[model samples]
Target: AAQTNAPWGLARISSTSPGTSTYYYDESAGQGSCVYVIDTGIEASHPEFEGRAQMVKTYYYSSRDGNGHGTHCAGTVGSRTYGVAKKTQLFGVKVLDDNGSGQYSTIIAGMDFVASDKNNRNCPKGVVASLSLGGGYSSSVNSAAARLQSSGVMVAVAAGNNNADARNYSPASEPSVCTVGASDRYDRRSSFSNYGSVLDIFGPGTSILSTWIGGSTRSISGTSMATPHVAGLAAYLMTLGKTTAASACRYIADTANKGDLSNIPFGTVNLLAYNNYQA
Candidate 1:
């Protein structure tokens, strides 16, 4: 279950009137959007989800989240108490197994399924994907993500936790996806986060407290955790009629809070992700 009290990152989603800390949730918040969490598996039974998460597939875990990775990521993406896109329908696509093992082919199969998926007799106008798994380059994953984007899925992928260049990775290096790297709450890049040209932005990935399996909540770390912030933000944008994945990505990248990660070596253009969808 989630804390129900929300997290520090939650209020930060809205811009705080220039210098004050007073902020509010988006007026047009997560009304109509969908998130496909492609990971180990989501604990749909988790209380934080509140019955919003739909178990779309189970490649290995068979609808159980024994590893807890996917549930934690899913909570960040859509759990009402700790998520940015609080009202979006959460769709779990299990690509990793019980032991946290994932095959790239299975991952693509999940993506393909969501690409042609619809909700309420209509294709989702705002579809966001959060892929928190991967290490090296894969042409297949890259191509699948591109096609998914073309089909209206806003993709956000982890830049990896190896502290190396993100270009060595697949979906992170993929042109159409928003590759997210990990940053601490203080806006400093995590020591273990991957960087480089392919990385689209950074988000809080250290000590992130979210829903876990077995109806509990705990903290975890990685660029894997950071990816969902972008994914959820994309969902918020979509509900406001930012339908296309390309436009949502551009708004997310362009509207990011400035000067938050000036210390990072990726130059001044790409900085930490800011959640103010209303800004």
Candidate 2:
């Protein structure tokens, strides 16, 4: 069956109604697409991955996911049990450390690596990058993100957790990046999520359950968690003919569930991420 009992965030995206408890998705939604998780790292051995996850690159000395943030985000993007695009291949591109912190140089390097790799692969379906970390404005990093997108990789970034204007953040503020904010199960903006006109959409983030380090599951909240959902959806869209970043972003924005969320601040886009799946 294409339907399953799912986490609230998963269920929310597949349904036009807000209160659905089941998630219905196309079995081949992301069949030939790939998602690059640019974060701390991923627990590639976790059962949730079903051998689909792999650590392809790392800025850190070690390839393992010690912080758990990256693993959780990866699970949301493409895990067998908790994924938004269950069939998508997940590549762990570690830019942060165990502390979940990194310099802009390292982050840009990771982005560059993905750009180069994607170019070499010549993947026709498409590539998507899930960036669940943010910092103060950095023109260099923003430029790198734009370059990645120009290379045809859809970049999904998180609005910061500062509860302030997302425009104050780096890649989130970048016009070329698909910046995502956080929404709760009740369809309200998360209190800690950054907002503003820079944001492209919102995704369910509060208490999101997904794979964690040590082969376990966890529920956490942040715009960080919300971003992978958008990234996963982008990957899913790639398989449906939204082969470029610009087209995928346009489709996502056009098809998002509109004007239904609560507590949207002034100037922020009111679109909520949707997988466009109908039962």
**TM-score versus the correct structure, for each prediction:** 0.90, 0.97
Candidate 1 TM-score versus the reference: 0.90
Q: How do the residues 1-279 of candidate 1 rate in per-residue lDDT, one tens digit apiece? A: 122245655555454322223325565556677788988888998889988887778876277888999999998888877777777788888888978777888888888877876443232557788999885798998998888878767888898998888888888889787888887766678888888888777777877778998999989999988888778888877887754676777777787876666357744244666755443
lDDT of 1 at 263: 54
lDDT of candidates 1 onward, in order? 0.77, 0.89
lDDT for residue 148 in candidate 2, whole number 0-100:
91
Worst lDDT run of 10 residues, candidate 2, spans 117-126
- In model 2, which regions exceed 4 Å deviation? 120-122
**Maximum-TM-score candidate:** 2
Top-lDDT candidate index:
2
The alpha-carbon root-mean-square deviation between model 1 and the true structure, to one decimal in Å, is 3.2
